[PDB]
Amino acid sequence: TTALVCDNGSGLVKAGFAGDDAPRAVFPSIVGRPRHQGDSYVGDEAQSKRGILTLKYPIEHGIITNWDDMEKIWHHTFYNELRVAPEEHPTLLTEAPLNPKANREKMTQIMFETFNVPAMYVAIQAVLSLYASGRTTGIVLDSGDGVTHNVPIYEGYALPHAIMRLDLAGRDLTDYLMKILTERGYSFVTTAEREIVRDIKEKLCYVALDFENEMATAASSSSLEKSYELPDGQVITIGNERFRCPETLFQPSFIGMESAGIHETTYNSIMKCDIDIRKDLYANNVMSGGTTMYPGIADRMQKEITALAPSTMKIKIIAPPERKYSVWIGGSILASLSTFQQMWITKQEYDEAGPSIVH
Ligand SMILES: Nc1ncnc2c1ncn2[C@@H]1O[C@H](COP(=O)(O)OP(=O)(O)O)[C@@H](O)[C@H]1O
Ligand SMILES: [Ca+2]
């Protein structure tokens, strides 16, 4: 039998078969129900029918908060995207770091009681990303759609006391760029327009090695300008917007938040950990999630952590090309191991013991 891997993303579901190199299904973590009851849609079909539906994010901040809609996302995943009978496949689910214990239990209860999977497992997203980089010790920066975490990991296990959470990720950067471009005179307010600005963000944005220098260059030449044709036929040119957008990850004050930036959350996370493991964390900073895809983010992180860390500390930022899917790939690996097969919670163990078995 083939095991399934479902990464329950704040913005995107990544689902597929354990052993595959990439998720076969990548779709928005969105459920749409009729505006007027006289039934649900999920993912791209929900967005297409948005004019007749109310759209909701059941996993908006990395934590599943709407269980009836998460049921719909999982039903869509099994039956519409992967086209499998869930009762025929062990299923690996991902959870956010600091997922409440009752939340993990509800994920377990739905898998067995609603979908009758024969076996399941819940793994921490950041832990899977570390495994996908061939490591069991290191500190992950996972920046997705709705949340960013630092997760220090030692000998295979997250250190929950040192986890840092930043309520700032890719959704917030798209919102910032929407606001910036709207103020420039291009109206970007609707769902369809959010899609356009997201596309501009992913194609043209980058992280400046030195913000102040990059601003001086954009102020004094056209050399950083990039153009993008909108659906209405207008050509928009952006310059400093390209790097002011993701600079928000290092200066959350750009969108009015008092939070530490990702360089300070990474450094604080490491300093919460055993002094004796900090050398290994500094040398093994892995970046995961779509919001770490910006060109220049690894060099910027190298520079910022160097300025914060002891003068002699060896600092390595690992940014794999496949890091949009590294949480999913780490699940594909773990669930493929012979040593993992005894780790599955079976439906039989669930029927004997109930949801508290997941711990
Ligand atoms: N090349 C890219 N550059 C910048 N942001 C990107 C890129 N590719 C994807 N993203 C952003 O990453 C987010 C989705 O990342 P992902 O790790 O799937 O999030 P989640 O797991 O929380 O659903 C979106 O905000 C998307 O716009
Ligand atoms: Ca994620």
Residues 102 and 7 in one domain: yes
Resolution as reported, in Å: 2.2
Query: What CATH number is associated with residue 198?
Result: 3.90.640.10
Pocket test of ligand 1: the residue of 287, 324, 325 to mutate, having most ligand atoms within 8 Å of its CB, is 324
Closest CA to 290 of 160, 199, 177: 199
Q: Which two tokens stand for residue 37?
A: 């009851």
Query: What CATH number is associated with residue 50?
Result: 2.30.36.70
Task: Provide the residue count of the chain.
Answer: 359
Cβ of 198 below 6 Å from ligand 1: yes
Residue-number span of the structural domain to which 307 is assigned:
127-173+263-325
Q: Which two tokens stand for residue 131?
A: 């495994």
Residues 107 and 196 in one domain: no
Distance 9 CA to ligand 2 centre (A): 5
Domain stops at, among 10, 36, 60:
60
Cβ of 171 below 6 Å from ligand 1: yes
Residues 317 and 337 in one domain: no
Distance 142 CA to ligand 1 centre (A): 10
Residues 199 and 318 in one domain: no
Domain stops at, among 213, 233, 262:
262
Quick check: 10 and 169 in contact, CB under 8 A? Answer: yes
Residues 90 and 40 in one domain: no
The Cβ-side half-sphere exposure at 209, using a 13 Å CA radius, reads 4
What would the 3-class secondary structure string for the chain be? CCCEEEEECCCEEEEEEECECCCCEEEECCEEEECCCCCCEEHHHHHHCHHHEEEECCCCCCCCCCHHHHHHHHHHHHHHHCCCCHHHCCEEEEECCCCCHHHHHHHHHHHHHHCCCCEEEEEEHHHHHHHHCCCCCEEEEEECCCCEEEEEEECCEECHHHCEEECCCHHHHHHHHHHHHHHCCCCCCCHHHHHHHHHHHHHHCCCCCCHHHHHHHHHHCCCCCEEEECCCCCEEEECCHHHHHHHCCCCHHHHCCCCCCHHHHHHHHHHHCCHHHHHHHHCCEEEECHHHCCCCHHHHHHHHHHHHCCCCCCCCEECCCCCCCHHHHHHHHHHHCHHHCCCCEEHHHHHHHCHHHHC
The two beta strands, 226-229 and 235-238, are antiparallel
* Phi (first) and psi of residue 319, to 5 degrees: -125, 85
The two beta strands, 285-288 and 317-318, are parallel
Residues 169 and 292 in one domain: yes
Which experiment gave this structure? X-ray
264/278 Cα distance (integer angstroms):
15
Q: What angle do CA 154, 8, 267 make, to 5 degrees?
A: 35
In the chain, how many domains are there?
4
Quick check: 106 and 67 in contact, CB under 8 A? Answer: yes
95/18 Cα distance (integer angstroms):
17
Distance 142 CA to ligand 2 centre (A): 7
* Phi (first) and psi of residue 27, to 5 degrees: -150, 150
Residues 159 and 275 in one domain: yes
